[PDB]
Paper text:
Therefore, we selected synthetic nanobodies (sybodies) against TM287/288(EtoA) in the presence of ATP-Mg completely in vitro. Thereby, more than ten OF-specific sybodies were generated and sybody Sb_TM#35 was successfully used to solve the OF structure of TM287/288(EtoA) in the presence of ATPγS-Mg at 3.2 Å resolution. Sybody Sb_TM#35 binds on top of an extracellular wing of TM287/288 and was crucially involved in establishing crystal contacts. Binding is mediated by aromatic residues of all three complementarity determining regions (CDRs) of the sybody, which are wedged between transmembrane helices (TMs) 1 and 2 of TM287 and TMs 5′ and 6′ of TM288. The OF structure of TM287/288 features fully dimerized NBDs that sandwich two ATPγS-Mg molecules at the degenerate and the consensus site. Further, the distortions found at the catalytic dyad of the consensus site of the IF structure (E517TM288 and H548TM288) relax during the transition to the OF state and the two key residues adopt a hydrolysis-competent arrangement. Interestingly, two tunnels that would allow for release of the cleaved γ-phosphate are present at the consensus site. The TMDs consisting of two wings each encompassing six transmembrane helices donated from both protomers are widely opened towards the outside. Indeed, the sybody inhibited the ATPase activity of TM287/288 in detergent (IC50 of 66.1 nM), as well as reconstituted in nanodiscs. The sybody was found to shift the transporter’s equilibrium towards the OF state, as measured in the presence of ATP-EDTA. In conclusion, the sybody acts as a molecular clamp that keeps the extracellular gate open.
Type I exporters are the best studied class of ABC exporters and minimally consist of two transmembrane domains (TMDs) each comprising six transmembrane helices and two nucleotide binding domains (NBDs) that are universally conserved among all ABC transporters. The NBDs undergo large conformational changes in response to ATP binding and hydrolysis, which are transmitted to the TMDs via coupling helices to assume inward-facing (IF), outward-facing (OF), and outward-occluded (Occ) conformations. Many ABC exporters including the entire human ABCC family exhibit asymmetric ATP binding sites, namely a degenerate site that can bind but not hydrolyze ATP and a consensus site that is hydrolysis-competent. The binders were instrumental to solve a crystal structure of the transporter in its OF state and were used to probe molecular events at the extracellular gate and their allosteric coupling with the NBDs.
Numbering used by the authors:
A (entry chain A): 2 to 569
B (entry chain E): 1 to 124
C (entry chain B): 22 to 591
The structure:
């Protein structure tokens, strides 16, 4: 019902397409009657004046039939493709609104199928409908009307053959639908195998597990064809069985008609015409059966499409969300307790601290402390189980998401670049950014020197994830991208992990000089880089180990001293 | 050189009968078609009766049916049309048409076609 | 027609089975014409003479005909469904197997979503040349042959008239079919483009969300989506424009044969009844002629998709030398001899890289960002080949050692950590599947991995998320380190293996790691110069050139570029 709304803006083409089919059909049904008038009345009588009179009329009705036929094809192609294009974009819009937990439910590989292959099935259903939505019932009603006009008593056996027909397409509905779902579920698995292989081919080659992955695919490929043969064997059995019942109706007509002629209830000349219009009823019945065969294939795809559309994201903006056009940078954590799963232990627990605007805080701690997790709470990527996160003395949940995220810039621990140009990727922060602004940002990130050295310059091609650049090069590009945005709150997850000490110094000292007034959070593994900060935040096993100056932490914070000793 | 003479057209009251003669003179080889058509004061060409000498099947107009009967005399070389129970609706000028096939006709090029004179048949 | 010949070659292993399909469909076609003939016969034999004593006999014959016709349809469909899916399976298999042979360079430059489209959307599109498409072609060619022999049986003169309209039908098919393939190949390439966007955007949606690029990616998607809608409508219109166009052509022929037939009747050759009969026999000829012509327009959708499938099937794949040798009794004699390399093959990355590593030596590779450290490693892994120079492992050239034995002797912990969506145990078992649970648990204990693995909901049997992102970045690196040590390679490469691993944990592993690294040659790439100072040899790289080489204390007193890098740390 919700998917029917996608055809509503294209209702003019949706009503014209079956109307043009009627125009074609009335012309195709007039073909034998007009060809009879040219031979039996034109040629037979010898009058050449009637030969051309019928001759021009037959070519004009064929022309109207052709115009009606092409028209039906044109109008059905518009509305069906426009249905799909509108649904594909509304699904991708929903997919963009999702959090990682939403993308983890509908596996990334499954979402690809749902946004393309599943829409295609619904789009094809609308295409098949628009053509024979009125052709199939009108030929069926018009056919039975012609059968009743000849003989009403003989039209009784036509009603007697409906029970095996109705039982057959009901069987195709109940058994069919879950089997077509399993094809769409098997395509998700072949997507999963090829996707993991593409995104990590170097690991496959390095460990020589190429034959293993070929077997991994073969298992998914064999399961896919087994899902296809199992759901389509259901039709290769039902259709010939239906055809048989359809042809058994002819024998039932000849047998009962034989009884009728024996009792003078029917004419011998009447049976000659009845045989033709009976096949028309049977042919039209197959078309009402064919739409059901398309309905069972589309019903599986409709469920998959609708559950994606009806899925609510993990992070949602409030109805009374305050607009945040101007921020200071007053980041605060009020007894914050976070868990990635209900079953797991608290990932973060007893987190209570405040950060003054413009101040630089060095975030430190052992692997898996919760540094990256703690930072993810600030741009509202995640929400705490207990406690609250506040920016400018305001609960992050009570503020508009685009307004909040617009003032916070991040440099993720695992840097990901996007396909296009260097210029496009740096403009990801601010689209309204000047060429002088992006150059200044890349100059602070020390990446400017490399970008200019390239033959295409700033318009140089960037591959998927930025694979065509070195580790620290794409890292320096990620720093520059965040800088462009001109944030009030900055997050740096091990900012220079893939950067040499010489370039590392140039970046850190460069940031201190031009990121004044911005509340910067810098996750680090090095004490010398941490000393640059106004205050140090130390984490150990989910809880806040300490918060204060280097001297305070060397005399009180045990894990800070533990980290200090491992370097000095 | 083949010519067709039309004779036997006069005033007959409703429900009456009248025979129409169509004499053909010339170097006729074999007549394959014999046709009769009526033309009203302001009409082009119509179709009343036709005869195909190969099978003998007669094709008549929808209004005529079991009234007019078309025939042809082989030895006399004259076409006939018997009109029975005449209604005042068929008051028009009647014409004759005949198709002849000569000895050894070209692969694609057709033979000849001949028309009649024309005689008025009035019925009231 | 070249792509058609290749596509039809996939039917060659099914030749005998396709002959049966043809044998069954010919019987189905001769029964399909015998059925209305028997209906017409029964009216003239039992109804017209009114002798209904023969009616049960004729009904039984007609019933057996229908029973045989329905059974043949089922038999045709059943054997064809399995026949068609065996072809589709082979095409999908051939695609995946090809990618495993194809070089790494392809995957980096071509969008992954487009490849995914070619494997599913394009291969599923060659189904409209198989199944019922083969049945309808077989049914068409028999009925066409059957009708044409019956036409000449009626009137030879009029048969030529119906055959003279055939070149016009073929011409309009040729015009429409060429346009159908044009817009359908374009539809499939825009589909792969759209699939590339959806795939890349989902995998990094966090970055899109963080930079509020949701709207800018929507309008980026809308450009390809509108293009797909535009070309899709064109391809759909051309696909079904032929059937109503051919009914117009049939009517031109019907009027032509009525004129020709009428002419012949006037020439004392035939009768009016013959014209009324020939129009009936022309209908049983036009029906398969229009059906086969429409089928030719329909197979263009499969032909266009076949091109995209074959495009992947003809890519210059990674091949071993004909006289390639297998490395037996590996020691670890790594050597570079005046090596030069460039990715773009215009601006050089590595310049005259020449160094020697004796077996068992723990060697450190250090330099600035984008120096060419990872490049040296990828060349030692033979992911790319040298422009000019030589790489010698155990005294044999890298090009002469088979890619199987080379990658078996050499192990790598890549700069960017790649994990899988399976159990922790299976992720560590990758590389060495013949490793006991004890060996896995002992190796994880050595790299301080076992601690967080035990904390997981299922332990080592905890199924990880896509690329194992349900762990901290450092924890992901620790798993990659464990996986590499479990693989037990004689040459091990640690390219920025502890980028996200804290200095405290890194110090704890380094001590236990040495015991399970002695007797093994290793290359350690690190920006934490303080950890690699104990190395047997320190190769200092700068702008694709080895500027300095030797031990830590020697390079420090030299006050060179290594000293400049080491002092910059504090
Ligand atoms: N796949 C690729 N395609 C094109 N250029 C590449 C590719 N991989 C690396 N490069 C370039 O090769 C040069 C050296 O890269 P690397 O070998 O990664 O350097 P590096 O010393 O390891 O630097 P890092 O990763 O930043 S510590 C740089 O100019 C990169 O842009
Ligand atoms: N998406 C996730 N799902 C489940 N657990 C997660 C997820 N992300 C992180 N964790 C766990 O949460 C804990 C803390 O996560 P992080 O914030 O990433 O750690 P960290 O202090 O940044 O450590 P590093 O990056 O390795 S120095 C670890 O025990 C992780 O395994
Ligand atoms: Mg982290
Ligand atoms: Mg690198």
């Amino acid at each position: 019902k919700t998917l029917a709304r996608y055809l509503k803006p294209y209702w003019i083409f949706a009503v014209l397409a079956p109307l043009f089919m009627v125009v074609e059909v009335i012309c195709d049904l007039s073909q034998p009657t007009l060809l009879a008038r040219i031979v039996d009345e034109g040629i037979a009588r010898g009058d050449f004046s009637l030969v051309l009179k019928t001759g021009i009329l037959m070519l004009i009705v064929a022309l109207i039939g052709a115009v009606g036929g092409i028209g039906c094809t044109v109008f059905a192609s518009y509305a069906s493709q426009n249905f799909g294009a509108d649904l594909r974009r509304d699904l991708f819009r929903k997919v963009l609104s999702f959090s990682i937990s939403n993308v983890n439910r509908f596996h990334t590989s499954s979402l690809i199928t749902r946004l393309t292959n599943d829409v295609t099935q619904l789009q094809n259903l609308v295409m098949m409908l628009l053509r024979i939505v009125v052709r199939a019932p009108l030929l069926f009603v018009g056919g039975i009307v012609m059968a009743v006009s000849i003989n009403v008593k003989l039209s009784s056996v036509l009603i007697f053959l409906i029970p095996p027909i109705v039982l057959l397409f009901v069987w195709l509905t109940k058994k069919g639908n879950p089997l077509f779902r399993k094809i769409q579920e098997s395509t998700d698995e072949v997507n999963r195998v090829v996707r993991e292989n593409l995104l990590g081919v170097r690991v496959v080659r390095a460990f020589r597990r190429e034959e293993y992955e070929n077997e991994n695919f073969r298992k998914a490929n064999e399961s896919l064809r087994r899902s296809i043969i199992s759901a389509f064997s259901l039709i290769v059995f039902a259709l010939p069985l239906f055809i048989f019942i359809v042809n058994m109706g002819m024998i039932a007509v000849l047998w009962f008609g034989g009884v009728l002629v024996r009792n003078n209830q029917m004419e011998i000349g009447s049976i000659m015409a009845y045989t033709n219009y009976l096949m028309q009823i049977m042919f039209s019945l197959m078309m009402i059966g064919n739409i059901l065969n398309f309905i069972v294939r589309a019903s599986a795809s409709a469920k998959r499409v609708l559950e994606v559309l009806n899925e609510k994201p993990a992070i949602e903006e409030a109805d009374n969300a305050l607009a945040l056009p101007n921020v200071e940078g007053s980041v605060s954590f009020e007894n914050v307790e976070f868990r990635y799963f209900e079953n797991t232990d608290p990932v973060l627990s007893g987190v209570n601290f405040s950060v003054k605007p413009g101040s630089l805080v060095a975030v430190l701690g052992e692997t898996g402390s919760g540094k990256s997790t703690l930072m993810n709470l600030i741009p509202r990527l995640i929400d705490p189980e207990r406690g609250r996160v506040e920016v400018d003395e305001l609960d992050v949940r009570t503020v508009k998401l685009k307004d909040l995220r617009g003032h916070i810039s991040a440099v993720p621990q695992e840097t990901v670049l996007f396909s296009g140009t260097i210029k496009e990727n740096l403009k990801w922060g601010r689209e309204d950014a000047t060429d002088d602004e992006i150059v200044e940002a890349a100059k602070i990130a020390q990446i400017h020197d490399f970008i200019i050295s390239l033959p295409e310059g700033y318009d140089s091609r960037v591959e998927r994830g930025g694979r065509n650049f070195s580790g620290g090069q794409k890292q320096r590009l990620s720093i520059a991208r965040a800088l462009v945005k001109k944030p009030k709150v900055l997050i740096l997850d091990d900012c220079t992990s893939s950067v040499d000490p010489i370039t590392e110094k140039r970046i850190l000292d460069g940031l201190k000089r031009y990121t004044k007034g911005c509340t910067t959070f810098i996750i680090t593994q090095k004490i010398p880089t941490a000393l640059l900060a106004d205050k140090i935040l130390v984490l150990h096993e989910g809880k806040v180990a300490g918060f204060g100056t280097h001297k305070e932490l060397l005399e009180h914070c045990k894990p800070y001293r533990e980290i200090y000793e491992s370097q000095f | 050189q083949v010519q067709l003479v039309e004779s036997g057209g006069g005033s007959v009251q409703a429900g009456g009968s009248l025979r129409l003669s169509c004499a053909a003179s010339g170097n006729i080889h074999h007549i394959s078609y014999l046709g009769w058509f009526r033309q009203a004061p302001g009409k082009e060409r119509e179709g009343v009766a036709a005869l195909w000498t190969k099978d003998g099947n007669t094709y008549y107009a929808d209004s005529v049916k079991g009234r007019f009967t078309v025939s042809l005399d082989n030895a006399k070389n004259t076409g006939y049309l018997q009109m029975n129970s005449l209604k005042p609706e068929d008051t028009a000028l009647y014409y004759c048409a005949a198709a002849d096939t000569g000895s050894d006709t070209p692969l694609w090029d057709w033979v000849y076609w001949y028309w009649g004179q024309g005689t008025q048949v009035t019925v009231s | 027609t070249a792509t058609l010949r290749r596509l039809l070659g996939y039917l060659r292993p099914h030749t005998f089975t396709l002959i049966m399909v043809f044998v069954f469909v010919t019987v189905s076609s001769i029964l399909g014409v015998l059925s209305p003939y028997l209906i017409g016969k029964t009216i003239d034999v039992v109804f017209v003479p009114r002798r209904f004593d023969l009616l049960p006999r004729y009904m039984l014959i007609l019933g057996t005909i229908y029973a045989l016709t329905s059974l043949l349809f089922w038999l045709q469909g059943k054997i064809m469904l399995t026949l068609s899916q065996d072809v589709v399976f082979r095409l999908r298999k051939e695609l995946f197997e090809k990618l495993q042979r194809v070089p790494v360079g392809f995957f980096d430059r071509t969008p992954h979503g487009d490849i995914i489209s070619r494997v599913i959307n394009d291969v599923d599109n060659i189904n409209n040349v198989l199944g019922n498409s083969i049945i309808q072609f077989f049914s068409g060619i028999v009925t066409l042959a059957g009708a044409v022999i019956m036409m000449f049986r009626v009137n030879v003169i009029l048969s030529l008239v119906t055959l003279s309209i055939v070149p016009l039908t073929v011409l309009i098919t040729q015009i429409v079919s060429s346009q159908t393939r044009k817009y359908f190949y374009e539809n499939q390439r825009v589909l792969g483009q759209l699939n590339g966007i959806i795939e890349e955007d989902i995998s990094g949606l966090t970055v899109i969300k963080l930079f509020t690029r949701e709207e800018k990616e929507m309008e980026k998607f809308d450009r390809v989506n509108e293009s797909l809608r535009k070309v899709g409508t064109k391809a759909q219109i051309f696909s079904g424009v032929l059937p109503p166009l051919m009914n117009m052509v049939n009517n031109l022929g019907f009027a032509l044969i009525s004129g020709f037939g009428g002419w012949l009747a006037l020439k004392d050759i035939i009768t009016v009844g013959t014209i009324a009969t020939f129009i009936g026999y022309s209908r049983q000829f036009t029906r398969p002629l229009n059906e086969l012509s429409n089928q030719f327009n329909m197979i263009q959708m499969a032909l266009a998709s076949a091109e995209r499938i074959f495009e992947i099937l003809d890519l210059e794949e990674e091949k071993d030398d004909p006289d390639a040798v297998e490395l037996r009794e590996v020691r670890g004699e790594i050597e570079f001899k005046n090596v030069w390399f460039s990715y773009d093959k215009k601006k050089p990355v590595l310049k005259d890289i020449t160094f020697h590593i004796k077996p068992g030596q723990k060697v450190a590779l250090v330099g600035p960002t984008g120096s060419g450290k990872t490049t040296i490693v990828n060349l030692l892994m033979r992911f790319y080949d040298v422009d000019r120079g030589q790489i010698l492992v155990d005294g044999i050239d890298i090009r002469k050692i088979k890619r199987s034995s080379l990658r078996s002797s050499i192990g790598i912990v890549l700069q960017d950590t790649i994990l899988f969506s399976t159990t922790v145990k299976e992720n560590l078992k990758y590389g060495n599947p013949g490793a006991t649970d004890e060996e896995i648990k002992e190796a994880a204990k050595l790299t301080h991995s076992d601690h967080f693995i035990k904390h997981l909901p299922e332990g080592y049997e905890t199924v990880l998320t896509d690329n194992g992102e349900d762990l901290s970045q450092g924890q992901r690196q620790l798993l990659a380190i464990t996986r590499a040590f479990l693989a037990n390679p004689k040459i091990l490469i640690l390219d920025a293996a502890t980028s996200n691993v804290d200095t405290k944990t890194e110090k704890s592993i380094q001590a236990a790691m040495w015991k399970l690294m002695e007797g093994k040659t290793s290359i350690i790439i690190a920006h934490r110069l303080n950890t690699i100072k104990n190395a047997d040899l320190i190769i200092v790289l700068r702008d694709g050139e080895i500027v300095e080489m030797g031990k830590h204390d020697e390079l420090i007193q030299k006050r060179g570029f290594y000293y400049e890098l080491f002092t910059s740390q504090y």
